[PDB]
Structures are given as structure tokens and as C-alpha cells.
Design a protein around this ligand. Structure first.
Ligand SMILES: [Cl-]
Length: 290
């Protein structure tokens, strides 16, 4: 389409149940990392999306919260550079991101990360304390993503041997795939997500903005980082998500120096920011104490 990436923000304000003028937002870049900068040049919160997502996953939450924020595109996602070695490990993501965040979000105490983003946040908190005052993990722990990585490994192996990146005859065909994976979800919300996560080729076909993740990375080291972090950790689970177990949550409590507790969001799957953004806004607002 010809549609600008900020053309649907009224839909995000309605989903967040807020009215009034939309906040200012623009895309920023420092080398390999692209981000959306909301509310001007002094972000209070950094948001890190999950595997297969981009920064726009946070639009509803950011519009509802009304705070200045930086929503970053992880390597291999959104407008951030791909890597030919297909490796978007939390550790590698953190190494690329830290100097960019020092430049674009030096005064943001709070980091909210979902899934791969949440483990990226843990590694940032460890390697760059001065930055990260407080972590909010959305539906992930090191153990939980390790279990997901182990289930998906055979198929991440098989896809790795297709060297095709896929192409799609239409936008609708990508939307059909996303409907198939979440058919109970409002299709205007799904359509908005696919719009941001996809682009049209000159040859009329469509492709995903994200790189197949051939590989994730390191978790023993990631638990050592949890043992060392001083940033308090809040966990947010999806009540309909099996991704994080009660034992996962207890393990996180035992290793963290300051676990603030788990919030369990009724009628949310794994992507709490997509399924129940209003409930996530209230929890993030509470952490801000604001
Ligand atoms: Cl992920």
C-alpha cells in the first residue's frame, strides 16, 4: 500500500480506550538498530518486542501509557539490519543495543521486554547497570524460552535448508496465516499487526520484515546474569499462556535479587501487549509509580 507507518495510530488509541491528540512519534536509527521514538527525545521507558515481532507491537501500550518511550526493533526484525548468520541471541542483541540505548535512551530507568526482548533486557541490565533501574518481563524466563527453542529446533533446522525467504501472492495470504494462528482475535487488530510486520515487493508479492531465526542462544550464562543483576524484576504472565510454568516463576523468584512478583493477566496468551494491552498499561503504569 502507499500507507505511512503512523496512519493507523487512531486504531491503537481506540484499542487502548484513550482519546485526544495522538502523541508525536518518529523512526530513529543508529547503524544496525531502528527504533520508534515516542513523545520527543527523552524516553522514560524502553520496550523490546518478541521473536517474529517489531517495535509496532507496543503502539497500543505506548499510546495508552502516555509516557515518552523508545520501542526498539531487535536485530533481524522491523527495520533493524538482518545478520547472515541468522543469530538473534539475547547476548548478541544486547551487545548491538547497549551503545545505541546509551545514545537514544540514556535516562530511561525502566525496560519492558516480551519473550526474546525480555531475555535481551536481562543481558542489558547485567552488562549496563547504570542504565536499567527496573525490568518488566512479559511472559518469559530464561528456562521458558530455552524450552521453546528446544521444541522448535528440528523445524528451524529444516527451514534453514530452504534458502527462499518465502514470497506471498497477496497481503490477504499473510493475514490468512495470522488468522489461522489466532482465529478468536479481532481481525482489524490482526490486519494492523501484519501491515507493520510485512512489506510489498515491486514484483507485487509480499514478504515478512523479520528474518527466520535459525538460532537463539546461551541460558546458563543468562541465569548468572539474573544472579548478578540489581534491577528489580516484575513478571507479567498471560493467564491462557502455558509458556511460563509455576516452577519457572519460582525459579525466577529464587535467583533474582529482587523479584516484585508475577501479574497473571486473565484471557491473554503469550503476547500480552497484543491480547490485553489495557491490563498491561495498568501494570506498567504501576511500576512507573505514576
Ligand atoms: Cl521469542
Amino acid at each position: 500500500t502507499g500507507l505511512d507507518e503512523f496512519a493507523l495510530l487512531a486504531e491503537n488509541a481506540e484499542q487502548a480506550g484513550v482519546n485526544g491528540p495522538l502523541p508525536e512519534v518518529e523512526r530513529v536509527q543508529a547503524g544496525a538498530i531502528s527504533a520508534l521514538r515516542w513523545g520527543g527525545s527523552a524516553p522514560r521507558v524502553i520496550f523490546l518486542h518478541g521473536g517474529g515481532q517489531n517495535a509496532h507491537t507496543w503502539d497500543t501500550v505506548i499510546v495508552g501509557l502516555g509516557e515518552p518511550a523508545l520501542a526498539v526493533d531487535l536485530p533481524g526484525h522491523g527495520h533493524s539490519a538482518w545478520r547472515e548468520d541468522g543469530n538473534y541471541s539475547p547476548q548478541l542483541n544486547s551487545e548491538t543495543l547497549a551503545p545505541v540505548l546509551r545514545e537514544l535512551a540514556p535516562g530511561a530507568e525502566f525496560v519492558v521486554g516480551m519473550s526474546l526482548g525480555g531475555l535481551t533486557a536481562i543481558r542489558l541490565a547485567a552488562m549496563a547497570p547504570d542504565l536499567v533501574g527496573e525490568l518488566v518481563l512479559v511472559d518469559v524466563t530464561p528456562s521458558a524460552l530455552q524450552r521453546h527453542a528446544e521444541l522448535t529446533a528440528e523445524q528451524r533446522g529444516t527451514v534453514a535448508l530452504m534458502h527462499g525467504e518465502r514470497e506471498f501472492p497477496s497481503f490477504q495470504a499473510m493475514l490468512d496465516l495470522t488468522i489461522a494462528a489466532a482465529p478468536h482475535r479481532d481481525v482489524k487488530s490482526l490486519r494492523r499487526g501484519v501491515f507493520h510486520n510485512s512489506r510489498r515487493l515491486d514484483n507485487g508479492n509480499w514478504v515478512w520484515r523479520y528474518d527466520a531465526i535459525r538460532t537463539f542462544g546461551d541460558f546458563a550464562g543468562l541465569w548468572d546474569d539474573v544472579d548478578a543483576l540489581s534491577a528489580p524484576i516484575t513478571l507479567v504472565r498471560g493467564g491462557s499462556s502455558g509458556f511460563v510454568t509455576d516452577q519457572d516463576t519460582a525459579e525466577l523468584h529464587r535467583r533474582a535479587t529482587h523479584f516484585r512478583g508475577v501479574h497473571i493477566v486473565e484471557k491473554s496468551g503469550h503476547s500480552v501487549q497484543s491480547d490485553q494491552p489495557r491490563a498491561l498499561i495498568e501494570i506498567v503504569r504501576g511500576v512507573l509509580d505514576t
